[PDB]
């Protein structure tokens, strides 16, 4: 497995080739590469941050195709398994849930969800009716319900 390797000497054209396989424009591809340059140190596995950042932006950009065809979400997961030389489906879900917490409070991640504020206005004001990160999102439960029916 590629996620078990620690301290990998990644180049500058590796993240570009990996982002082109998921059909991503040049605007969202440069933001993922720039996030790795500033976070070169203070990491355990470089493959866990790259895989967690590419799959996080895939559901935001391709949000119009996931709602119409539920098979797009099940296909985008098996593709990353062959590139990472892994066979466990739990490692892919555990990787996209750790990088999302670190990118939940940035600037480039906010403009990506707007083009493709309602939740950040309650955390700073100290509201008791804010969206707690405990339960599963409503848009995620509808995808799993259709995946078990096919």
């Amino acid at each position: 497995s590629l996620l078990v390797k620690k301290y990998c000497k990644m180049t500058t054209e590796e993240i570009i080739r990996l982002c082109n396989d998921f059909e991503l424009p040049r605007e969202v591809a440069y933001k993922i590469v720039d996030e790795y340059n500033i976070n070169a140190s203070r990491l355990v596995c470089p493959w866990q941050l790259v895989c967690g950042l590419v799959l996080n932006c895939t559901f935001i950009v391709f949000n119009e195709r996931r709602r119409k065809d539920p098979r797009i979400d099940h296909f985008i997961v098996s593709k990353m398994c062959s590139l990472m030389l892994t066979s466990k489906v739990d490692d892919v879900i555990e990787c996209v849930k750790l990088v999302k917490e670190l990118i939940i409070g940035e600037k480039w991640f906010r403009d990506l969800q707007i083009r493709y504020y309602d939740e950040i206005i309650f955390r700073k004001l100290g509201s008791m009716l804010q969206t707690t990160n405990i339960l599963v999102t409503d848009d995620q439960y509808n995808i799993w319900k259709k995946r078990i029916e096919m």
């Binding site: 301290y7 000497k9 070169a40 140190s41």
Partner: protein, 96 residues
């Protein structure tokens, strides 16, 4: 008669050690690590293979050469720097 080589070695592990050692010496103001310190790790690792009469340096001799340079650089600083570098570089010293 016996000359050990550096075949089949973790090239990515040596690059991560020098990257974390040079980043800690700048923020703390310690001794700057140039390129001469990187070649000293291979010299100590080659000497460990000669003590075992082996012609190849395995992963056991590489982990012992890094601890020698780390112990010689951490103890060569101040008191506040010795108590800080011993906690960040404790992963490379404590081998599995």
């Amino acid at each position: 008669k016996i000359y050990p080589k550096l075949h089949q070695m973790d090239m990515d592990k040596v690059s991560r050690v020098y990257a974390d050692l040079r980043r800690e010496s700048i923020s703390t103001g310690s001794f700057p690590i140039t390129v001469r310190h990187l070649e000293s790790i291979l010299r100590i690792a080659e000497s460990f293979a000669k003590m075992r009469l082996s012609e190849f340096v395995s992963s056991y001799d590489l982990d012992r050469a890094i601890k020698v340079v780390v112990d010689s650089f951490v103890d060569a600083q101040k008191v506040s720097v010795r108590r800080q570098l011993r906690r960040s570089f404790a992963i490379y010293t404590l081998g599995h």
